[PDB]
């Protein structure tokens, strides 16, 4: 409508495009964290299966375990690096959501504001719990690798 | 626990807001179809006056209608400056709707997938139907031209 309303509509177009991009990036981040956690869980499950089949160690399965340990060191460094980069990308996505919320609050949407606040608190609890679980998973993996000496 | 109740009251607020929004958009769609028909008829009526009534009146009215053509062309460009953003906002709406359909198919929410598919279909039908009224008027103008020429 007016000049301020025209600016609102232009920033609405821009923020809708960047929110399409932000939804894509956030869904990709959620799927990547899911793959993170499920790969860690699958590696731990395979290790638990190998420990449950103890006593009948053979050359084939022990060589497989050696490969798993080498790939587990590589996975440790890769998991640390990708945890750093995923945290950085989540911070970038949070900043994008922050500017989108600034545009929406300058627009005047209040139902969207309260829905976003409820979503923010719920996902804050959820991501805190899931990230604590993940970090504990790699902490336990590192501790087990360290105590493998004895 | 289950976040079903959280989703329930979130979408209850969302559905109240979108019911108010649906009534408001019914009113705004009445307004928009009225404005779009008025703009298309203004364009075609100025074209009709440009083509049909030259030379019948005297010289002073000839100069008057020429200055009217110039000024009305400038004012029509100024007024039509708003319609260029409509195409781009429909482009981003179609892209976002296709993304929503794909994301809901991926997540598996049948109700959300149906909602997004019908969302893209309905916005397509609405914009294509206002544009269809416009292009029906344009086709009538072209038919009147080809019948008037021959």
From Swiss-Prot, chains A, B:
Effect after changing residue 14 to D: Monomeric. Impairs interaction with BIRC6. Impairs ability to inhibit BIRC6 caspase ubiquitination
Protein name: Diablo IAP-binding mitochondrial protein, cleaved form
Underlying gene: DIABLO
Full-protein positions shown: 68 to 217 of 239
């Amino acid at each position: 409508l007016s000049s301020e309303a025209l600016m609102r509509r232009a920033v609405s177009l821009v923020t809708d495009s960047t929110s399409t991009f932000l939804s894509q990036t956030t869904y990709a981040l959620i799927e990547a964290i899911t793959e993170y956690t499920k790969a860690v869980y699958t590696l731990t499950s395979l290790y638990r299966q190998y420990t449950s089949l103890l006593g009948k160690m053979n050359s084939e399965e022990e060589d497989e375990v050696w490969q798993v340990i080498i790939g587990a060191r590589a996975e440790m460094t890769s998991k640390h690096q990708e945890y750093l980069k995923l945290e950085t990308t989540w911070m970038t996505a949070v900043g994008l959501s922050e500017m989108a919320a600034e545009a929406a609050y300058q627009t005047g949407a209040d139902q969207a504001s309260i829905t976003a606040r409820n979503h923010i608190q719920l996902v804050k609890l959820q991501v805190e719990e899931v990230h604590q679980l993940s970090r504990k998973a790699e902490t336990k993996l590192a501790e087990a690798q360290i105590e493998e000496l004895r």
